[PDB]
Amino acid sequence: ENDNAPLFTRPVYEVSVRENNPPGAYLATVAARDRDLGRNGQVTYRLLEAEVGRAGGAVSTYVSVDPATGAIYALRSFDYETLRQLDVRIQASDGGSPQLSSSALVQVRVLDQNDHAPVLVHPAPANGSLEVAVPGRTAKDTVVARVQARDADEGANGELAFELQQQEPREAFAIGRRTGEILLTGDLSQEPPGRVFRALLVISDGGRPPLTTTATVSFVVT
């Protein structure tokens, strides 16, 4: 007779997938055992339907389970900023009369990918350039500007670092690495109102490799 239900080898499986996977990417596999000979022992897997968290959609929109192999594939590329974990409930069910069934839970965890370069929020870039007015009579180490940038990623992938490079004519300004404050280090006395100091603003994140964005800073001396 059909005197054995399908036992999942594990009541809860745990799987990790990195963000921005290819559609159809194999996520994992589940296994239920039916110690019965013949059709009493042929087991079929089904995906149990369920919402995704709070009004995220349907679970069948995100994964699919193979009915014979227990293979669990992804139907779309996962976005970590949009979804970190999803719960997939699978049901193993034999072919006896009446059917015997059991359930298990796959906890799919989404890992972060460095898929965001830092963005310069303020001062806003224009044609890849930046304007900064610096009154001639200013004291040393006074905040001329404040650079604010954002990065959506996690950990070091969102850890930003600011830098000034390729100053001309001379190295008169500096920027705090984590601060984003642009201060006046050099002397600014023997200068005409029109004079300009050009630099390259460099904003990096802590990726490996890092993602970098840049701007063209112009300090005009008023």
Ligand SMILES: *[C@@H]1O[C@H](CO[C@@H]2O[C@@H](C)[C@@H](O)[C@@H](O)[C@@H]2O)[C@@H](O[C@@H]2O[C@H](CO)[C@@H](O[C@@H]3O[C@H](CO[C@H]4O[C@H](CO)[C@@H](O)[C@H](O)[C@@H]4O)[C@@H](O)[C@H](O)[C@@H]3O)[C@H](O)[C@H]2NC(C)=O)[C@H](O)[C@H]1NC(C)=O
């Ligand atoms: C961003 O800014 C650049 C300005 O250039 C930069 O500015 C500074 C910050 C430094 O980075 C410099 O090193 C850079 O040069 C703007 O560039 C201009 O773009 C316009 C179009 O958008 C260009 O005009 C076109 O180019 C052709 C000009 O032909 C001329 O020469 C022939 C002789 O061979 C002559 O017959 C003709 O009449 C022209 O005199 C032309 O084919 C075309 O029809 C049109 O005129 C212009 O030349 C660029 N200037 C420079 C200096 O490169 C960018 O437009 C700006 N972008 C944005 C989004 O703001």
Ligand SMILES: *[C@H]1O[C@H](CO)[C@@H](O)[C@H](O)[C@@H]1O
């Ligand atoms: C598998 O099937 C049994 C009945 O055969 C159900 O009780 C169970 O909930 C699952 O659907």
Ligand SMILES: [Ca+2]
């Ligand atoms: Ca069975």
Ligand SMILES: [Ca+2]
């Ligand atoms: Ca993303």
Ligand SMILES: [Ca+2]
């Ligand atoms: Ca990311």
Ligand SMILES: [Ca+2]
């Ligand atoms: Ca990043």
Ligand SMILES: [Cl-]
């Ligand atoms: Cl697919």
